[PDB]
Coordinates of N, CA and C and ligand atoms in Angstrom, one line a residue:
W1 N 111.7 109.6 113.5 CA 111.3 110.4 113.2 C 110.5 111.4 114.0
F2 N 110.6 110.6 115.2 CA 110.1 111.5 116.2 C 110.9 111.7 117.7
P3 N 111.6 113.3 117.8 CA 112.4 113.7 118.9 C 111.5 113.2 120.3
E4 N 112.3 113.1 121.5 CA 111.6 112.5 122.6 C 111.0 114.2 123.6
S5 N 111.2 114.9 122.5 CA 110.8 116.8 122.8 C 109.0 116.1 122.4
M6 N 108.8 115.7 121.2 CA 107.9 115.4 120.6 C 106.7 114.3 121.4
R7 N 107.3 113.4 121.8 CA 106.9 112.3 122.7 C 106.7 112.1 123.8
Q8 N 106.9 113.6 124.5 CA 106.5 113.8 125.4 C 105.0 114.9 125.5
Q9 N 105.0 115.6 124.6 CA 104.0 116.3 124.0 C 102.6 114.5 123.6
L10 N 102.9 113.8 122.9 CA 102.5 112.8 122.5 C 101.7 112.0 123.0
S11 N 102.6 111.9 124.1 CA 102.2 110.9 125.2 C 101.2 111.4 125.9
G12 N 101.0 112.6 126.3 CA 99.7 114.1 127.0 C 98.9 113.5 126.0
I13 N 98.6 113.2 125.2 CA 97.8 113.3 123.9 C 96.9 112.1 124.1
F14 N 98.1 110.9 123.7 CA 97.6 109.3 123.9 C 97.1 108.8 125.0
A15 N 97.7 109.3 126.2 CA 97.0 109.6 127.2 C 95.6 109.5 127.3
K16 N 94.8 110.4 126.5 CA 93.6 110.1 126.7 C 92.8 109.6 125.7
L17 N 93.6 108.5 124.6 CA 92.6 107.3 123.8 C 91.9 106.3 124.9
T18 N 90.6 106.2 124.5 CA 90.1 105.3 125.4 C 89.8 104.0 123.8
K19 N 89.8 104.5 122.8 CA 89.5 103.4 121.9 C 90.9 102.9 121.3
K20 N 90.6 101.6 120.5 CA 91.5 101.5 119.8 C 91.5 101.9 118.4
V21 N 92.7 102.1 118.1 CA 92.7 102.8 116.4 C 93.6 101.5 115.6
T22 N 93.1 101.5 114.6 CA 94.4 101.0 113.3 C 94.2 101.5 112.2
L23 N 95.8 102.0 111.9 CA 96.6 102.7 110.5 C 96.1 101.6 109.5
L24 N 95.6 101.7 108.8 CA 95.9 100.5 107.6 C 96.6 101.4 106.2
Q25 N 97.9 100.8 105.9 CA 98.9 101.4 105.0 C 98.8 100.2 103.8
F26 N 98.5 100.6 102.7 CA 99.1 100.3 101.4 C 100.0 100.2 100.6
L27 N 101.1 99.4 101.0 CA 102.4 99.4 100.1 C 102.9 98.8 99.1
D28 N 103.4 99.7 98.8 CA 103.6 99.3 97.0 C 105.7 99.4 97.7
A29 N 105.7 98.0 97.5 CA 107.5 97.8 97.8 C 108.6 98.0 96.6
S30 N 107.9 98.4 95.6 CA 109.0 99.3 94.6 C 108.9 100.7 95.3
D31 N 107.5 101.0 95.9 CA 107.6 102.9 95.7 C 108.2 103.0 96.9
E32 N 109.8 103.7 97.2 CA 110.2 104.2 97.9 C 109.4 105.3 99.1
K33 N 108.7 106.0 98.3 CA 107.8 107.3 99.2 C 106.6 106.1 100.1
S34 N 106.2 105.0 99.8 CA 105.6 103.6 100.1 C 107.1 103.4 101.7
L35 N 107.8 102.8 101.4 CA 109.1 102.4 102.1 C 108.9 103.6 103.3
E36 N 109.3 104.4 102.6 CA 109.2 105.8 103.6 C 108.0 106.2 105.0
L37 N 106.8 106.0 104.2 CA 105.4 105.7 105.2 C 105.7 104.6 106.0
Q38 N 105.7 103.5 105.8 CA 106.1 102.4 106.4 C 107.0 102.5 107.6
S39 N 108.2 103.3 107.4 CA 109.0 103.6 108.3 C 108.5 104.3 109.5
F40 N 107.7 105.5 109.0 CA 107.1 106.8 110.1 C 106.1 106.3 110.5
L41 N 105.4 105.1 109.8 CA 103.9 104.5 110.5 C 104.3 103.4 111.4
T42 N 105.2 102.7 111.2 CA 105.5 102.1 112.3 C 106.2 102.2 114.2
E43 N 107.1 103.5 113.7 CA 107.6 104.2 114.8 C 106.5 105.0 115.2
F44 N 105.8 105.1 114.5 CA 104.3 106.6 114.9 C 103.5 105.4 116.1
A45 N 103.0 104.3 115.3 CA 102.3 103.3 116.3 C 103.3 102.6 117.5
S46 N 104.2 102.4 117.6 CA 104.8 102.2 118.8 C 104.7 102.9 120.0
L47 N 104.3 104.3 119.4 CA 104.1 105.4 121.0 C 102.7 105.4 121.5
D48 N 102.2 104.3 121.0 CA 100.9 103.5 122.1 C 100.3 102.3 122.0
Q49 N 100.5 102.1 123.0 CA 99.4 100.4 122.7 C 98.0 100.2 122.1
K50 N 97.5 101.3 122.4 CA 96.0 101.3 121.5 C 96.5 101.8 119.7
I51 N 97.5 102.2 119.4 CA 97.5 102.4 117.9 C 98.0 101.3 117.5
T52 N 97.8 100.6 116.2 CA 97.6 99.3 115.7 C 98.5 100.2 114.6
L53 N 99.7 99.5 114.1 CA 99.8 99.2 112.0 C 99.6 98.6 111.8
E54 N 98.8 97.8 110.6 CA 98.6 96.5 109.5 C 98.7 97.2 108.6
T55 N 99.4 96.3 107.6 CA 100.2 96.6 106.2 C 99.4 95.4 105.3
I56 N 99.1 96.0 104.0 CA 98.7 95.4 103.0 C 99.4 95.9 101.2
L57 N 99.4 94.4 100.8 CA 100.5 95.1 99.9 C 99.6 95.5 98.6
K58 N 99.6 96.3 97.8 CA 98.9 97.5 96.9 C 98.5 96.6 95.7
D59 N 97.6 96.3 95.4 CA 96.8 95.5 94.3 C 96.5 94.0 94.7
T60 N 96.9 93.9 95.7 CA 96.9 92.6 96.3 C 95.0 92.2 97.0
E61 N 94.5 93.4 97.1 CA 93.1 93.2 97.8 C 92.1 94.2 97.6
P62 N 91.7 94.4 96.1 CA 90.9 94.8 95.2 C 89.6 95.5 96.1
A63 N 89.0 94.4 96.7 CA 87.9 94.4 97.5 C 87.9 95.8 98.3
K64 N 89.6 95.7 98.8 CA 89.3 96.5 100.4 C 89.6 98.1 99.4
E65 N 90.5 98.0 98.4 CA 91.1 99.1 98.4 C 89.3 99.9 97.5
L66 N 88.8 98.9 96.8 CA 87.7 100.0 96.6 C 86.9 100.2 97.9
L67 N 86.6 99.6 98.5 CA 85.7 99.8 99.7 C 86.3 101.3 100.6
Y68 N 88.0 101.6 100.2 CA 88.7 102.6 101.0 C 89.2 104.0 100.2
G69 N 88.2 103.5 99.2 CA 88.5 104.6 97.7 C 90.3 104.8 97.1
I70 N 91.1 104.0 97.4 CA 92.2 104.0 97.3 C 93.0 103.9 96.1
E71 N 93.4 105.2 96.2 CA 94.0 106.0 94.3 C 95.3 106.6 94.7
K72 N 95.6 107.6 95.1 CA 97.0 108.4 95.6 C 97.5 107.4 96.5
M73 N 98.6 107.5 96.3 CA 100.4 106.5 97.1 C 100.9 107.7 97.4
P74 N 102.0 107.7 98.1 CA 101.3 106.7 99.8 C 100.1 106.7 100.1
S75 N 99.6 105.5 101.0 CA 98.5 105.7 101.5 C 98.2 105.1 102.8
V76 N 97.9 105.6 103.5 CA 97.1 105.4 105.0 C 95.9 105.5 105.5
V77 N 95.3 104.8 105.8 CA 93.7 105.3 106.1 C 93.5 104.6 107.9
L78 N 92.6 105.0 108.4 CA 92.3 104.8 109.6 C 90.9 104.2 110.0
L79 N 91.1 103.1 110.7 CA 90.1 102.5 111.0 C 89.6 102.6 112.6
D80 N 88.3 102.6 112.9 CA 87.9 102.5 114.2 C 88.6 101.1 115.4
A81 N 87.9 101.1 116.1 CA 88.3 99.9 117.3 C 87.7 98.7 116.8
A82 N 86.0 98.7 115.8 CA 85.4 97.8 115.9 C 85.9 97.3 114.2
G83 N 87.2 98.0 113.3 CA 87.2 97.7 112.0 C 86.6 98.4 110.9
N84 N 85.9 99.5 111.0 CA 85.0 100.2 110.2 C 86.1 101.8 110.0
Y85 N 86.0 102.0 108.3 CA 86.5 103.2 108.0 C 85.8 104.4 108.0
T86 N 86.6 105.4 109.1 CA 86.3 106.2 109.6 C 85.8 107.3 108.2
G87 N 86.5 106.9 107.0 CA 86.5 108.0 106.2 C 88.3 109.2 106.1
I88 N 88.8 108.7 106.8 CA 90.0 109.3 107.3 C 91.4 109.0 106.6
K89 N 92.1 109.7 105.5 CA 92.8 109.0 104.6 C 94.1 110.2 104.6
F90 N 95.6 109.8 104.5 CA 96.6 110.6 104.4 C 96.9 110.4 102.8
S91 N 97.2 110.8 101.9 CA 98.1 110.5 100.8 C 99.0 111.0 100.7
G92 N 100.4 110.9 100.9 CA 101.5 111.4 101.2 C 102.0 110.9 102.7
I93 N 102.9 111.3 103.4 CA 103.8 111.3 104.7 C 103.4 112.6 105.5
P94 N 102.3 112.2 106.4 CA 102.3 113.5 107.3 C 103.4 113.9 108.7
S95 N 104.5 113.6 107.9 CA 105.5 114.2 108.6 C 105.7 116.0 108.8
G96 N 107.0 115.9 109.7 CA 106.9 117.6 109.6 C 106.0 118.0 110.5
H97 N 105.2 118.8 110.2 CA 104.4 119.5 110.6 C 103.4 119.1 110.4
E98 N 103.1 118.2 109.9 CA 101.4 117.1 109.1 C 101.3 116.3 110.6
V99 N 102.6 116.0 111.3 CA 102.2 114.9 112.4 C 101.0 115.2 113.5
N100 N 100.9 116.9 113.6 CA 99.7 117.4 114.5 C 98.6 116.7 113.5
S101 N 98.3 116.5 112.4 CA 97.4 116.3 111.5 C 97.0 114.9 111.9
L102 N 98.2 113.8 111.7 CA 97.9 112.2 112.1 C 97.5 112.0 113.8
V103 N 97.7 113.2 114.6 CA 97.7 112.7 116.0 C 96.5 113.0 116.6
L104 N 95.9 114.3 115.9 CA 94.6 114.8 115.9 C 93.7 113.8 115.5
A105 N 93.6 113.1 114.5 CA 92.8 112.0 114.2 C 92.5 110.8 114.8
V106 N 94.2 110.4 114.9 CA 94.2 109.2 115.7 C 93.1 109.5 117.3
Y107 N 93.8 110.8 117.9 CA 93.1 111.2 118.6 C 91.1 111.4 118.9
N108 N 90.7 111.5 117.6 CA 89.1 111.3 117.6 C 88.9 110.7 117.3
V109 N 89.3 109.7 116.6 CA 88.7 108.2 116.2 C 88.8 106.8 117.8
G110 N 89.9 107.5 118.5 CA 90.4 107.0 119.6 C 89.9 107.6 121.2
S111 N 89.2 108.2 121.1 CA 88.4 109.0 121.7 C 87.0 109.4 121.3
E112 N 86.2 110.2 123.2 CA 85.1 111.3 122.6 C 85.1 112.4 122.1
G113 N 86.8 112.6 121.9 CA 87.0 114.3 121.6 C 86.7 114.8 122.3
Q114 N 87.2 116.2 122.3 CA 86.7 117.3 123.1 C 85.4 117.8 123.1
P115 N 85.2 118.5 123.8 CA 83.7 118.7 124.6 C 83.2 120.0 123.1
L116 N 81.8 120.0 122.8 CA 81.6 121.0 121.2 C 80.3 121.1 121.8
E117 N 80.1 122.1 121.1 CA 78.9 123.0 121.5 C 77.8 121.8 120.4
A118 N 76.4 122.1 120.6 CA 75.7 121.0 120.6 C 75.0 121.7 119.3
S119 N 75.4 123.5 119.0 CA 75.1 123.7 117.7 C 75.8 123.0 116.5
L120 N 76.6 122.8 117.0 CA 78.5 122.9 116.1 C 77.8 121.1 115.8
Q121 N 77.8 120.3 116.9 CA 77.7 119.4 116.5 C 76.3 118.6 115.6
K122 N 75.4 119.3 115.9 CA 74.1 119.0 115.4 C 74.5 119.1 113.8
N123 N 74.8 120.3 113.5 CA 75.2 120.7 112.0 C 76.2 119.7 111.5
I124 N 77.0 119.1 112.1 CA 78.0 118.0 111.3 C 77.3 116.9 111.2
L125 N 76.3 116.2 112.2 CA 75.9 115.1 111.9 C 74.7 115.3 111.1
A126 N 74.2 116.5 110.7 CA 73.1 117.0 109.8 C 74.1 117.2 108.4
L127 N 75.0 117.1 108.4 CA 75.9 117.5 106.9 C 75.6 116.1 106.0
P128 N 75.2 116.4 104.6 CA 75.1 115.3 103.7 C 76.2 114.2 103.4
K129 N 76.5 113.2 102.5 CA 77.3 113.0 102.0 C 78.6 113.8 101.1
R130 N 79.7 113.6 101.2 CA 80.8 114.3 100.8 C 82.2 113.8 101.0
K131 N 82.9 114.5 99.6 CA 84.5 114.3 100.2 C 85.0 115.1 99.9
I132 N 86.5 115.3 101.1 CA 87.2 116.3 100.9 C 88.6 116.4 100.8
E133 N 89.0 117.0 100.0 CA 90.5 116.6 100.3 C 91.1 117.9 100.6
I134 N 92.4 117.7 101.4 CA 92.5 118.9 102.3 C 94.5 119.1 101.8
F135 N 94.2 119.6 100.7 CA 96.3 119.6 100.3 C 97.3 120.7 101.0
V136 N 98.3 120.6 101.0 CA 98.9 120.6 102.3 C 100.4 120.6 101.3
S137 N 101.7 121.3 102.4 CA 102.8 121.1 101.9 C 103.5 120.5 103.6
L138 N 104.4 120.0 103.4 CA 104.9 119.5 105.0 C 105.6 120.5 105.7
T139 N 105.7 121.6 105.2 CA 106.6 122.9 106.2 C 105.2 124.1 106.6
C140 N 103.9 123.9 105.9 CA 103.1 125.0 106.1 C 102.4 124.8 107.3
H141 N 102.2 125.9 108.3 CA 102.2 126.0 109.2 C 100.5 126.0 109.6
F142 N 100.0 126.8 108.7 CA 98.4 126.4 109.5 C 97.9 125.4 108.6
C143 N 98.7 124.6 107.6 CA 97.5 123.7 107.5 C 96.8 122.4 108.0
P144 N 98.1 121.9 108.8 CA 97.4 120.9 109.9 C 96.2 121.2 111.0
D145 N 95.5 122.4 110.8 CA 94.4 122.8 111.9 C 92.8 122.9 110.8
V146 N 93.2 122.6 109.3 CA 92.2 122.7 108.5 C 92.1 121.2 108.2
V147 N 93.4 120.7 108.5 CA 93.3 119.0 108.1 C 92.4 118.5 109.6
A148 N 92.7 118.9 110.7 CA 92.4 118.2 111.7 C 90.2 118.0 112.0
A149 N 90.3 119.7 111.4 CA 88.9 120.1 111.2 C 88.0 119.2 110.4
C150 N 89.0 119.0 108.9 CA 88.0 118.4 108.0 C 87.8 116.5 109.0
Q151 N 88.8 116.1 108.9 CA 89.3 114.9 109.2 C 88.3 114.4 110.9
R152 N 87.9 115.4 112.0 CA 87.4 115.6 112.8 C 86.1 116.3 112.6
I153 N 85.5 116.5 111.4 CA 83.7 115.9 111.2 C 83.4 114.6 110.6
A154 N 84.8 114.2 109.6 CA 84.6 112.6 109.3 C 84.5 111.8 110.5
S155 N 85.3 112.0 111.5 CA 85.1 110.9 112.9 C 84.0 110.9 113.1
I156 N 82.9 112.2 113.2 CA 81.9 112.2 113.7 C 80.5 112.0 112.9
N157 N 80.8 112.6 111.5 CA 79.7 112.1 110.5 C 80.1 110.6 109.5
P158 N 79.4 109.8 109.8 CA 79.9 108.7 109.1 C 79.8 108.6 107.2
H159 N 79.3 109.8 106.9 CA 79.0 110.0 105.2 C 80.4 111.3 104.8
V160 N 81.0 111.8 105.8 CA 81.8 112.5 105.0 C 83.1 111.5 105.2
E161 N 84.0 112.3 104.4 CA 85.4 111.4 104.6 C 86.7 112.6 103.8
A162 N 87.8 112.6 104.4 CA 88.5 113.4 104.9 C 90.0 113.5 104.3
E163 N 90.7 113.6 102.9 CA 91.7 113.2 103.2 C 93.2 114.3 103.1
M164 N 94.3 114.0 103.5 CA 95.2 114.7 103.4 C 95.8 114.4 102.1
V165 N 96.4 115.8 101.5 CA 97.3 115.1 100.4 C 98.2 116.5 100.1
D166 N 99.4 115.8 100.5 CA 100.5 116.3 100.4 C 101.0 116.5 98.4
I167 N 100.5 117.5 98.4 CA 100.5 118.2 97.2 C 102.0 118.3 96.2
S168 N 102.5 118.6 97.4 CA 104.3 118.3 96.6 C 104.4 116.9 96.4
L169 N 103.7 116.2 96.6 CA 104.5 114.3 96.0 C 103.3 115.0 94.5
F170 N 102.5 115.4 93.8 CA 101.1 115.3 92.8 C 101.3 116.2 92.1
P171 N 102.7 116.9 91.3 CA 102.9 118.4 91.1 C 101.8 118.2 89.6
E172 N 101.3 117.5 88.7 CA 101.0 117.4 87.6 C 99.4 117.6 88.3
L173 N 98.6 116.9 89.1 CA 97.3 117.6 90.0 C 97.3 118.8 90.5
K174 N 98.7 119.5 90.9 CA 98.6 120.8 91.6 C 97.8 121.4 90.0
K175 N 98.7 121.5 88.8 CA 98.4 122.1 88.3 C 97.1 122.2 87.3
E176 N 96.8 120.3 87.2 CA 95.3 120.6 87.2 C 94.2 121.3 87.3
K177 N 94.3 121.1 88.9 CA 93.5 121.7 90.2 C 93.3 123.2 89.7
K178 N 94.4 123.7 90.1 CA 95.0 124.6 89.9 C 95.4 125.0 91.7
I179 N 96.2 124.3 91.8 CA 96.2 124.8 94.0 C 97.3 125.6 93.9
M180 N 97.6 126.7 93.8 CA 97.6 128.0 93.8 C 98.5 128.1 95.8
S181 N 97.5 128.3 96.7 CA 97.8 128.9 98.2 C 97.8 127.3 98.6
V182 N 98.6 127.5 99.9 CA 99.5 126.2 100.8 C 98.4 125.3 100.8
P183 N 97.4 126.0 102.0 CA 96.5 125.3 102.5 C 95.2 125.1 101.5
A184 N 94.5 124.4 100.9 CA 93.5 124.3 100.3 C 92.6 122.8 100.1
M185 N 91.4 123.0 100.3 CA 90.2 122.5 100.1 C 89.3 122.1 99.4
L186 N 89.4 121.0 98.3 CA 88.0 120.8 97.7 C 87.3 120.1 98.2
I187 N 86.2 120.2 97.6 CA 84.8 119.1 97.9 C 84.0 118.8 96.9
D188 N 84.4 117.4 97.3 CA 83.3 116.7 95.8 C 84.3 117.1 94.5
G189 N 85.4 117.4 94.4 CA 86.0 117.2 93.3 C 85.2 118.3 92.9
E190 N 84.8 119.7 93.3 CA 84.3 120.6 93.1 C 85.4 122.1 93.4
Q191 N 84.5 122.4 94.4 CA 84.4 123.7 95.1 C 86.4 123.7 95.5
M192 N 86.6 124.4 95.3 CA 88.0 124.7 95.9 C 87.8 125.7 97.1
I193 N 88.7 126.0 98.1 CA 89.0 126.9 99.4 C 89.4 126.7 100.3
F194 N 90.5 128.1 99.7 CA 91.7 128.3 99.7 C 91.8 129.5 101.8
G195 N 93.2 129.0 102.4 CA 93.5 129.3 103.6 C 93.0 128.7 104.6
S196 N 93.4 129.5 105.9 CA 92.5 128.7 107.1 C 91.0 129.0 107.4
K197 N 90.3 128.4 108.3 CA 88.8 128.2 108.0 C 88.9 128.0 109.4
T198 N 87.7 128.5 110.1 CA 87.1 127.7 111.1 C 86.5 126.4 110.9
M199 N 86.1 125.9 112.4 CA 84.9 124.7 112.2 C 83.6 124.6 111.6
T200 N 83.1 126.3 112.1 CA 81.7 126.7 111.7 C 82.0 127.0 110.2
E201 N 82.6 128.0 109.4 CA 83.4 128.1 108.2 C 83.1 126.9 106.8
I202 N 84.0 126.1 107.9 CA 83.9 124.5 106.6 C 82.6 124.0 107.4
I203 N 82.1 124.2 108.6 CA 80.3 123.4 107.8 C 79.5 123.7 107.4
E204 N 79.6 125.4 107.2 CA 78.8 126.0 106.2 C 79.3 125.2 105.0
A205 N 80.5 125.5 104.6 CA 80.5 125.1 103.2 C 80.6 124.0 103.1
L206 N 80.4 123.1 103.8 CA 80.3 121.7 103.7 C 78.5 121.5 103.6
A207 N 77.9 122.1 103.9 CA 76.4 122.4 104.0 C 75.4 121.9 102.9
Ligands
LIG301 O1 91.9 114.5 128.9 C1 91.1 114.6 128.9 O2 90.0 113.8 129.2 C2 90.0 116.0 129.1 C3 88.7 116.0 128.9 C4 88.1 117.5 128.4 C5 89.8 118.2 127.9 N1 90.9 117.1 128.3

């Protein structure tokens, strides 16, 4: 899944990791996309000692599934070093260009993150409880930026959750919610917001 070209870049980033991180997949052994995700994550986890992949079979741990709100499949969530749910989730496989999203989520959970303005970080911490779904395709070039911003907010604010959704895996959901444009944010199952958005714009929408 990862060319040595990528591994050169990812090692630069993973060198910055100061805290351990756990990727927890809920694996349905009878679903091909779950097995693909397992193959992807196994290789991804091998990129750094601080990244652990753990596997739980779907429908064996209902208390955990409740705790992490596991609905869409395939599914993987991010846990911090202490074992706590960061609110960061991927529904589908974040392969192709979405590797960017997974890398940034791991970086933000396994480090202190990039220097940020007190103005921005105040607003992030000030945000109320919220659940964000970021709909993407694997070939959408502007999608990872939006995903990474929302999931960075989730990594800082304990009440914000940010779920990447590969919309091409959920065609019925695409019609229902009317995801027409390629990157789309859905907040608390209500307000749709399409197109690229800055951190400050996202924070405002979350306010
Ligand atoms: O990798 C690091 O540690 C530095 C910190 C700010 C930007 N990069």
